[PDB]
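[step 3/7] inverse_fold.run input=structure_tokens len=117
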């Protein structure tokens, strides 16, 4: 699941190792998140956290992961083979991967001290 998100990001940013580059960035990229996002990238992570929060409230997710997707020519496509929960999470992941590829990356915000969140 994390493995798929990591792959989606690499589809959009081929030079990155996402679990290293994007983990522990700002107040929202990484486990949990609170306070105000520090920049646009952190705002991508906040939306992504809110998309997963939304997912946990859908009737279909109740029993809910591991969805199917493809990367081709640097474009991500979620598969129609995905059941409702899986399709919703593939869309949260795809939107965040795209979001990350479109905003600046600030080294000053990597491993930010949470006292700032
Ligand atoms: Ca988070």
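[step 3/7] decode complete -> sequence:
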């Amino acid at each position: 699941a994390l493995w798929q998100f990591n792959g989606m990001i690499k589809c959009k940013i081929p030079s990155s190792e996402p679990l290293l580059d994007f983990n522990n960035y700002g107040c929202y990229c990484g486990l949990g998140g609170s306070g105000t996002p520090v920049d646009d990238l952190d705002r991508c992570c906040q939306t992504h956290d809110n998309c997963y929060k939304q997912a946990k409230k859908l009737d279909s997710c109740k029993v809910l992961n591991n969805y199917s997707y493809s990367c081709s020519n640097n474009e991500i496509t979620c598969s129609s083979e995905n059941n409702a929960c899986e399709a919703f999470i593939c869309n949260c992941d795809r939107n965040a991967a795209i979001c990350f590829s479109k905003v600046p990356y600030n080294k000053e915000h990597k491993n930010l001290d949470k006292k700032n969140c």
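[step 4/7] annotate
The two ends are 26 Å apart (CA to CA).
Residues 28, 30, 32-33, 45, 49 surround calcium ion (CB under 6 Å).
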